[PDB]
Amino acid sequence: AAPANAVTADDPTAIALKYNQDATKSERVAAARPGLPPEEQHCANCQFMQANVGEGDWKGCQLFPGKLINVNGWCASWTLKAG
Ligand code: SF4
């Protein structure tokens, strides 16, 4: 059960960015974003994930202010995490 402020799939930013809460159900292979082989990409290894927002598997994303993503998710703005 998702948190009350989870990003929903038909949010227009979720549509534009092809966000999915489950990276295995995402377009990561198609997008081929640089930094890691596509099958390795998910929110937890993305620079925009906020480790200090949310709890557990439901964490912040700088691109979805006020909402929570799933650490196991993905979107087309996936960017290799610096830390
Ligand atoms: S920008 Fe990064 S943390 Fe935010 S939803 Fe996309 S892949 Fe996940």
UniProtKB/Swiss-Prot annotation:
Temperature dependence: Thermostable.
Keyword Iron-sulfur: yes
UniProt subunit comment: Homodimer.
PROSITE patterns to which the protein is assigned, alphabetical: HIPIP
Protein's job: Specific class of high-redox-potential 4Fe-4S ferredoxins. Functions in anaerobic electron transport in most purple and in some other photosynthetic bacteria and in at least one genus (Paracoccus) of halophilic, denitrifying bacteria.
Matches recorded under SUPFAM superfamilies: HIPIP (high potential iron protein)
Protein name: High-potential iron-sulfur protein
GO BP term, example: aerobic electron transport chain
Record organism: Thermochromatium tepidum
UniProt-annotated binding residues for [4Fe-4S] cluster: C43, C46, C61, C75
Keywords, comma-separated and alphabetical: 4Fe-4S, Electron transport, Iron, Iron-sulfur, Metal-binding, Transport
GO MF terms, alphabetically ordered: 4 iron, 4 sulfur cluster binding; electron transfer activity; metal ion binding
Record family assignment: Belongs to the high-potential iron-sulfur protein (HiPIP) family.
